[PDB]
Symmetry: C3
Subunit: 148 residues, 3 copies
């Protein structure tokens, strides 16, 4: 099936975009770098699952999200993809992650893939978005804002 | 785990339709966000008027996104500002291109993606932009999206191409030329 | 003036002169191929030192990617378009060169290994996307099988070159962990 190869490929594409973003991290021992690396592993499991996906990593993502949200101001503006190297790269990862989601979706719904793979990808773009903001905040960057 | 509205693989348009995330509309808005993000990263390599231009373009790509997520077949009276995509930013890209073009050597051979970090990031952006044009086109040719969105993305890749060239020249980088 | 506006309505030309909508699978394959060449272009900028022979290789590969573009823009039924085996066989030689210098590998390598190596894993993914786009074209007999072969062998090249970059830099690449 072509749809499976497409979904696996786009998952790998995401993981490799994360791989490149990780290279932008200049200081050693950041916990989000650990997290991104764990996600990459999960993406490999996504890969073979597509080709039973437990809920744990979704929960993991949800607690990391909540951790970073509580450290950040409320979200009042619409931001443009920005805020420093890592941040921008994560915004790109977010876009690619959302593309992966769209590719997995028909596979679920056809019941060829565990529902949770979609949920994980859905939640991953929230993680990547949140992490981007968190990363920019910690560089004290200030992201660019929408203007007509 | 949370029960998020997107978890069963459906999302919403700005007109209230529920569609599988699979849908053309989301392929089209996703790919546009992808493009804007790529530009976001390219901006981070600015080492500048053209940096200002790239941001305005990101802002237009927001509008593009609002437009794509508002199918004309179901736009009502209050959504008219989203369904209406004015020509202005296109004329802008055109006059920007003329400006840069009048500062560049004449062009006759095929340029490979190259020219320094900013220039190469821009060539990648251009490629992503043309993918975004491919996603928008079927919405336009189905009457769901203003044709001006497509004009824009069409022109944008020529803008992004000529800026790449400009950046290369202002760094003293010669781009590679197609060989054989 | 570089823009004609003639594609402003969503249509464009194949190298046969046929007008098609821009979302036609021919354009999807050509574009994805451009995307790949652009990704290689960026990875090329991550090379610090002068005179790396792989850097010369990737640039030759960009040239072939243009040829792959043209071939794809010239679908066979509507025409006469053959893609020669040469750049494939050449890729195969370069692959052996790097492959033979590498540790035997039993792990699963996560996209990692430094900037170059990382950029090249991404390139590999985009190349694999380009393969997936070329596949329908070959199966309906619009494109020479060799074109798919080239991108396939190029996926292999980019993976193993990323391993090579990582090893030269002495940059440990990350492994799959359960
Ligand atoms: N995978 C996707 N690709 C492109 N666009 C999307 C995708 N998912 C959602 N969208 C669009 O972007 C908007 C914001 O995305 P969001 O992720 O918040 O929606 P969702 O996935 O339906 O909701 P939730 O993430 O809260 O479950 C959505 O209303 C939808 O129009
Ligand atoms: N968005 C696209 N994605 C992939 N391939 C394209 C795209 N647009 C055009 N092509 C192909 O690449 C060639 C050069 O593209 P170009 O953008 O100059 O064409 P166009 O959009 O038809 O014309 P113009 O841009 O001058 O209005 C075209 O002749 C066509 O074969
Ligand atoms: Cl795609
Ligand atoms: Mg979502
Ligand atoms: Mg949301
Ligand atoms: Mg064009
Ligand atoms: Mg042109």
């Amino acid at each position: 099936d072509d749809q499976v190869f497409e979904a696996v490929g786009t998952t790998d594409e995401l993981s490799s975009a994360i791989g490149f973003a990780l290279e932008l991290v200049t200081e050693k021992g950041h916990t989000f770098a650990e997290e991104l690396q764990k996600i990459q592993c999960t993406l490999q499991d996504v890969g073979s699952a597509l080709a039973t996906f437990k809920a744990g990593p979704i929960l993991e993502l949800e607690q990391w999200i909540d951790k970073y949200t509580s450290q950040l101001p409320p979200l009042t503006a619409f931001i443009l993809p920005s805020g420093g190297k890592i941040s921008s790269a994560l915004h790109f990862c977010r876009a690619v992650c959302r593309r992966a989601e769209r590719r997995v979706v028909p596979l679920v719904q056809m019941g060829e893939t565990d529902a949770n793979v979609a949920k994980f990808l859905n939640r991953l773009s929230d993680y990547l978005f949140t992490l981007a903001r968190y990363a920019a905040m910690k560089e004290g960057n200030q992201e660019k804002i929408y203007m007509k």
